[PDB]
Design a protein around this nucleic acid. Structure first.
Lengths: 136, 191, 169, 195, 64
RNA sequence: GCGGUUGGAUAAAUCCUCGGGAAUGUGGCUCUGCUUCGGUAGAGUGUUAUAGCCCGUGGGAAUACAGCCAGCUGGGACUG
RNA sequence: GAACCGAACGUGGAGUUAAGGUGCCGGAAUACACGCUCAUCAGACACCACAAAAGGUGUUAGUUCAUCUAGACAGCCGGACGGUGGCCAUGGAAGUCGGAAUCCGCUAAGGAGUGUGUAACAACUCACCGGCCGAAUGAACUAGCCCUGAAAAUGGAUGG
RNA sequence: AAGCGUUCAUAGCGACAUUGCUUUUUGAUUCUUCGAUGUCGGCUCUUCCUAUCAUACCGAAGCAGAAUUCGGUAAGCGUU
């Protein structure tokens, strides 16, 4: 080589200033920061812009995203909202492949029966063009 | 209480290297190469500054953190072996009957053979393991030395010579005979 | 779990009007249990009982700052099979009522101590990272704490799956 | 309690007497250190120390005394103070010339080159096995045990054992008579190498 | 044991319980006809939180 | 699944205002140096500065928990 | 399972619970939350079909006391005398068969001495203090779950 | 674990106390059977238990060797 070589590893670290998605409860499918850590299966969270109050919660009920930014250790609510907007965490979230596939099935759920009939006709037109091109 | 994170730091010499994916550790150096599969442990490695590795555990226990420190010792012995090499000496304490030792070949296997041990007619036979040379000592008589890279294979081979020269049905404090280990260390001197 | 205040008195008997009043910070599920536990602890101090006395006030004591992490230090007396022993545990919880709740779980887990055989002596919120003695709390009071969560698992409402799932995180 | 006395008493020197004359004293082996101080009893005062590197670093401050900055680097290995302002030359003659000596070695690095001579030892037959076991050839020419032909037993390098030390301490000197040697000399200030 | 360690005049042992309770036994014509037992031996009856042995000593000893 | 009210420290906090307090001490400056001199990482100093926390004084609301409505709307079963 | 727990009964329909349960057999959460245990004999729910004294650095929590800016424990080396064979005892007792004394010096520190060893010395070794190294360690106890203690006859039973 | 064992509590033993297990001894009791379950041993034949006398392989000794003593995993195999 001759300089070593280790693979090595890559995890999502739980920390102060780690934005997370909420699975269940009154929130469900929102976003919030981690303000300060308590212990192992326990953490404080807040995200007043997206709409979620201040609460202690299990890390099993929440889930870590791959997005982070600088926050003071153990901040309040209004100070987090100042940093939230400046970094542009909401805009970075929408462009991700996770959020687009989340937003896709929400649109699929709200389809009317007339709209579903158009998906038959438009998709049949694509198949004819693709099948002709692949043959050559 | 479960330790939230514990870690130990390896220090690699100049010439040697280490190649780690999953838990397979191919060490190479001046003398040769060695390998070891640690696929029963759940640790994680991190390269820092070429000649420095950090082994660590995340949320262990009392029993799990014991295996953290032992892996530091296991990998260090491969680096110590591949740089210098280990050397285990042996002596045969004989009282009445003089013990003979030879190395006769058979299908490229190489067996260490022992005869006339405590007046026995049965010719005894201990095999030589992979990657360890058997040699006789000049100047010092009544001696045999085992040398190689792997500390595990050399020490095991030296033990099998000792434990196939036991006395049976006698009082062992009286009949003080066998092939005992005198010294165990390194090949390269001044270290 | 709430954190009631129970102010008793004793009766206004003829000869000695105006008794001295006595206050306690009782933990209980509801108002009926709070008055029961008041007379229990008062009976181990003065010559009183439910017949010879009355409750003056019952107030709930909510937490001042319930959205902030605090390091509590609780003193406890508890009765084992053989005898009775004193202890001093330490908890890292968001409220007093939340901290006392988690103590009753920990005593029942390790020592097999039930609700009936646990006396809560005194609960104190500690100030400085220095007063805390225990190592299992002091792990989480360090400078720039970070750690991953290895070996994540999913939870399907469905039975069957067609992927061979991963535990990456 | 005890460190407080050693904190206070170390400030008294070099605040008179003002020639510190330090020496180890590491492998002694004494016995006769006891007497080196008791021959120094009339004039000098001795004080061996532990980790007082933090002490002499803190005592380097003071304000009215910045002369103790020279004493904090040299203390490596077993070292201790023998402060006394007689001169520096006269005390050097008393301590070094006295020395420790005394036998000998029982399982460590060897002395100077040992070399046993011929001619009778002064022993009737008994332990001729132990002489031949450690190299030395013997021949009983009438009665007592006599050694024939001179050969070196142990050279300066390889270790000396416990059993072989039995006859050396009684009969044949190694020699491993090792004495104390001075490290530094002071008289201001003044970093004197002493030679 | 205490005499071996320190000395015979380094303490004062005191037993604070006396056997007054007489036991009975039915040793064996018939079987269990007229089965009133006869005196066997003595014993002492003890409650919870009651002292059996008492020893006063100096502060130096204790461990012996 | 929504609405209207009553009580509590006329909820407690957040937020606003007037004080005090320090550290798992931000910025600066100090300082060993380390440098691709780009920048760097460690110790050190000291009270908000180009991060911000903790505790209370004063002010005005929402919300949660608990109660009540001779409040409002929908779906399903059995019986004649 | 005569007796225990819950409930007392005309014939049918709809709702709701008692005691007891909710991996499957079996109707009902492979629910939610915090711990503890790994047993080459694990354990599993009242009456009910058994287990004790005594022990374990297996692991978990706790009580009382000690040393800590060089910890001290490590753990590898350096010292372990001077008065001195202390008085006594008697073949001989020199720190070490014993009967009481228990004091100083130099002191970094060295008991008129922890043992080994000798006819008694010699020789070795600890107690106490340094040298190397740089942040928590040492002693005595209390109770949780596991293990040793725990051996019977056809093949076998937390209901499986 | 007081003593025995030349010396030395535990190689092998073990007073004074004290916790157990077992149903191959014998008592205690009278639930089953008196409109009947053919009651002592020996002969013959099968299988099960281990609290192991022998054989296989090991540890301890006041085990020099031979012989013997105490214990371990063992009911495979044999016991006139």
């Amino acid at each position: 080589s001759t300089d070593s070589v280790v693979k090595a590893s890559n995890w999502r670290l739980v920390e102060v200033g780690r934005v997370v998605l909420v699975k269940q409860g009154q929130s469900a499918g929102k976003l919030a920061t981690i303000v300060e850590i308590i212990d192992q299966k326990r953490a404080l969270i807040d995200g007043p812009t997206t709409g979620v109050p201040r609460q202690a919660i299990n890390l099993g009920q929440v889930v870590l995203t791959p997005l982070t930014f600088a926050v003071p250790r153990g901040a309040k609510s209004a100070t987090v909202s100042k940093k939230w907007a400046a970094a542009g965490v909401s805009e970075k979230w929408a462009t991700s492949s996770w959020a687009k596939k989340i937003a896709q099935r929400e649109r699929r759920a709200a389809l009317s029966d007339f709209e579903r009939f158009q998906v038959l006709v438009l998709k049949k037109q694509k198949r004819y063009a693709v099948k002709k091109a692949v043959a050559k | 209480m479960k330790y939230i994170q514990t870690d130990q730091v390896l220090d690699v010499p100049e010439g040697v290297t280490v190649q780690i994916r999953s838990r397979i550790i191919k060490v190479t150096g001046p003398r040769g190469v060695l390998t070891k599969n640690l696929k029963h442990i759940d640790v994680t490695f991190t390269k820092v500054s070429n000649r420095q590795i950090k082994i660590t555990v995340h949320n262990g226990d009392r029993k799990h953190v014991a295996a953290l420190r032992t892996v530091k010792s296991l990998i260090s012995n491969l680096i110590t072996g591949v740089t210098k090499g280990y050397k285990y000496k042996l002596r045969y304490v004989y009282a009445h009957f003089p013990i003979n030792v030879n190395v006769i070949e058979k299908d490229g296997a190489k067996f260490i053979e022992i005869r006339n041990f405590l007046g026995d007619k049965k010719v005894r036979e201990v095999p030589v393991r992979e990657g360890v040379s058997v040699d006789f000592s000049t100047n010092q008589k009544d001696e045999i030395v085992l040398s190689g890279n792997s500390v595990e294979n050399v020490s095991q081979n030296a033990a099998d010579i000792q434990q196939i020269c036991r006395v049976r049905n006698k009082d062992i404090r009286k009949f003080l005979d066998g092939i005992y280990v005198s010294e165990k260390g390194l090949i390269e001197e001044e270290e | 779990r709430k954190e009631y205040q129970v102010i008793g008195r004793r009766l206004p008997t003829e000869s000695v009007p105006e008794p001295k009043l006595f206050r306690m910070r009782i933990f209980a599920p509801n108002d009926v249990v709070a008055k029961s536990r008041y007379w229990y602890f008062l009976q181990k101090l003065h010559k009183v009982k439910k017949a010879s006395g009355e409750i003056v006030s019952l107030n709930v004591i909510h937490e001042a700052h319930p959205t902030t992490v605090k390091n509590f230090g609780v003193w406890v007396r508890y009765d084992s099979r053989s005898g009775t022993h004193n202890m001093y545990k330490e908890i890292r919880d968001v409220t007093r009522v939340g901290a006392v709740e988690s103590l009753y779980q920990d005593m029942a887990a390790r020592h097999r101590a039930r609700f009936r055989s646990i006396h809560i002596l005194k609960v104190v919120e500690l100030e400085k990272t220095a007063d805390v003695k225990r190592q299992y709390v002091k792990q989480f009071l360090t400078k720039d704490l970070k750690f991953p969560l290895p070996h994540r698992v999913q939870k399907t409402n469905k039975v069957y799956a067609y992927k061979r799932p991963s535990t990456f995180y | 309690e005890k460190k407080a006395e050693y904190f206070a008493k170390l400030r008294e020197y070099l605040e008179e007497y003002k020639s510190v004359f330090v020496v180890g004293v590491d492998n002694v082996s004494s016995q006769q250190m006891h007497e080196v101080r008791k021959n120094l009893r009339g004039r000098a005062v001795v004080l061996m120390g532990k980790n007082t590197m933090v002490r002499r670093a803190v005592r380097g401050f003071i304000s009215d005394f910045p002369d103790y900055e020279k004493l904090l680097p040299f203390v490596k290995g077993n070292v201790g103070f023998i402060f006394t302002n007689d001169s520096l030359q006269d005390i050097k003659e008393v301590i070094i010339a006295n020395k420790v000596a005394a036998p000998a070695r029982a399982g460590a690095v060897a002395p100077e080159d040992i070399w046993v001579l011929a001619v009778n030892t002064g022993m009737e037959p008994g332990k001729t096995s132990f002489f031949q076991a450690l190299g030395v050839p013997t021949k009983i020419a009438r009665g007592t045990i006599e050694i024939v032909s001179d050969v070196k037993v142990v050279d300066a390098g390889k270790r000396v054992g416990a059993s072989e030390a039995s006859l050396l301490n009684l009969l044949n000197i190694s020699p491993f008579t090792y004495g104390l040697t001075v490290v530094q000399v002071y008289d201001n200030g003044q970093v004197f190498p002493a030679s | 044991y205490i005499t071996k360690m320190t000395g015979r005049d380094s303490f004062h042992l005191r037993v604070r319980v006396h056997p007054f309770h007489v036991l009975r036994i039915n040793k064996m014509q018939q079987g269990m006809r007229g089965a009133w037992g006869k005196p066997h031996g003595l014993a002492a009856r003890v409650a919870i939180g009651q002292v059996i042995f008492s020893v006063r000593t100096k502060d130096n000893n204790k461990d012996t």
